[PDB]
RNA sequence: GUGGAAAGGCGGGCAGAGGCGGUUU
């Protein structure tokens, strides 16, 4: 349940570390279905809350996905990947857990047809941030 | 009674943010307090509601400071007393701020005939009960220029994330806040269209509209301008009177005021009779 | 038999689904505009001694609808004898108050064999409020207006049974004029405008004495089973009197209908259409 | 009496975000089935008539010679005395507002407003010559709705007290700026003398619509409609009986509402003026 | 020889008032 994790979230990061390491084991683009994509995003944001990371520290990376989202939608990716690395540099600590999910997705995206795979990548990255606030 | 059309005065120019502005509305990631944006292009504009509403506001306080002086020029300004109807919850108890909207009192004339004499409600309109005096101006929504749209293409920053803090005085603990702000220097194509309904007193409305603009260049434009977020500036591109014949024959022979590198204070004080001398010849 | 199906593809809303007498009015106004008054005198004589049209019926993506015959109400229990008696009652009244049937189910109702109703209707009658504004002091004073809105592929068709030489000279030029003016209703707001296509439809009807009308008829004698549609009209700004028509799906026994001429005090005579359009039916016992 | 139908086809572009409204707290008019907005034929005809009646109200003295039915009217409305048609231009009262509608066939035959838009009258009528079809979205602006983009947006406006700065918000659903619709106007050529004056008057009211607004708030900057003309076809009297393409087509790809009357009416329409 | 002919869902309404990204060891 998505609502059941909020009763337990409010050493506990280790029990969800197997869920994050399994999701980081699968790195192919569109390797999960539509319902399975959002089910991965619940496990990500619950893992990103036990060792909690604020959205601001991420906010520069979230800017570069969104300004491209207007440029992809009837209007490059290495500019976001260069920022996703450099923002993960000045950690302190849980920025590496967020880097282990972006950089497998962005290495496949690095060479990819632009119109489809980024618009499918953009739906997963919303639900990570979207669900992160639902738990805190 | 007797609505007539003589033509339109169209004012085109560039609103410039000398300091970064903020209008704002109540995306997933983003600043807590963002700025209004165009839903199709994602660029932050300036609405015509926010520009007309601030000009009507600043012109109403300009009347209450001089109700002794404006009363001899315009009838139906002796219908009331200076102040607001805020204590006595009455729609017409003899004050200038007579109509409440939901909780706040705004000067609105209640009848068509008293709105044709008020300087605030000739230019901006009334909507009383059984009355409905329509406005004589149209204030379009103000989008970015063709120059500052190319700056968004090249990667230059249009917006900004200004961070402010309110400090508790006794314990010195800080509460932080973030507010989206357009980068200072950005420019906006605005447009203001006055309908020449009466050739008697079109000249008073142009002086009253340009008076309110120079008040708005002294005050701010939306969103916490006591802290710096205003300092806005009108730069006039073109000034143009489209005569009624213009719409008949379609020819581009419609009379023009140069208005080049001239301020809102130059159009009223320096050369109002020199510039508008040729508009008067056609009317 | 084989009919010509004049398919009217909507460009917007319709005021109403046009009856057979307001199609013949609209065709008759189209002929005097294009040709003149001498060709209306030959258009009327070709329908008195010949061809007949029907009312307008909806379609929805090559699923042509036809009116339910009035023969299936007396014998509705006799049609549904082979059905479970705990649900014969709700099946009966749902089948009874239905208005249209498609071609598969319209053929089965003429032979009193079991059938089903459509689940979706291809249109909705919509209440759109309009306003009237004072020119000077813009006082709003609203009124309410009814329109038929269609789906993305739905529309309106009507049938034609007659010789090809009359269709090629009168009905086919009228529907290109009537595509650009309206087909009844507020045509100044773009209501009633449409694109016309021509097809051919086949109905397998049993041979008997009794037959259903697919149009309003103004019968010459007493019918067998019927539904009274009481309508008048308006002709060049002159009010037509309310006449008792018969509805679509009513059952006659060798009744041609009859075309009524009303003086109406107008430059020319006004003919109101009123003619049958028979397909054979089997009545109950 | 009938001669043909001049058909004007073009694209209506919402340069600023448009509102018409049906009664998010103030929803715009939509289709009942798909849910897309449009522009009604009543809103576009009723605005072109309203803009052109104020145009004729200002020129009643100068147009008595060309239009002989304007000698009976003085500029103003019959509202200050609750009385029907007597001298004032805005003579007909429908429910609570006053409109110029001519009272007869023979008077509306020589009125610039009512020979084009029509008149109700009593004991006689005058039907319209134009048909202003509804304007739905283009096919290009329909797959953006299919892809998932917003075709309407929520504009939240507030009302500020002048003494206390008390804020009072409200919402207004608004068709997104930039969106393009497709219009059509069908002018019925009833009289071969009256048609040049009727197309010029229709294009004049379309030129007043580009500097005024269309529906909604407008004074707060909503309407701002731009007209792009795809084509002009004539469809003569001989087209309707034989069906062969005798359609005289006037070509306009980037022509404005002003450039179709910027001496272009006399030039481009040289063939419709030929075949009458 | 069209249950027709005529009729802008519209007038007025600032997303705004307050707030030292710096404390403290
Ligand atoms: Zn006033
Ligand atoms: Zn008239």
Swiss-Prot record, chain C:
Species this protein is from: Thermococcus onnurineus (strain NA1)
Superkingdom, natural source: Archaea
Quaternary structure annotation from Swiss-Prot or TrEMBL: Probably part of the Csm effector complex, that includes Cas10, Csm2, Csm3, Csm4, Csm5 and mature crRNA. Interacts with Cas10 (csm1).
GO MF entry, a single one: RNA binding
Regions annotated as coiled coil: none
Residue ranges of the TM segments: none
Protein name per Swiss-Prot or TrEMBL: CRISPR system Cms protein Csm4
Keywords: Antiviral defense, RNA-binding
Additional free-text comment from the UniProt record: Encoded in a type III-A CRISPR locus.
NCBIfam families: cas5_csm4 (TIGR01903)
GO process terms (BP): defense response to virus
Family: Belongs to the CRISPR-associated Csm4 family.
General function of this protein: CRISPR (clustered regularly interspaced short palindromic repeat) is an adaptive immune system that provides protection against mobile genetic elements (viruses, transposable elements and conjugative plasmids). CRISPR clusters contain spacers, sequences complementary to antecedent mobile elements, and target invading nucleic acids. CRISPR clusters are transcribed and processed into CRISPR RNA (crRNA).
InterPro entries reported for this sequence: Csm4
Gene of this entry: csm4
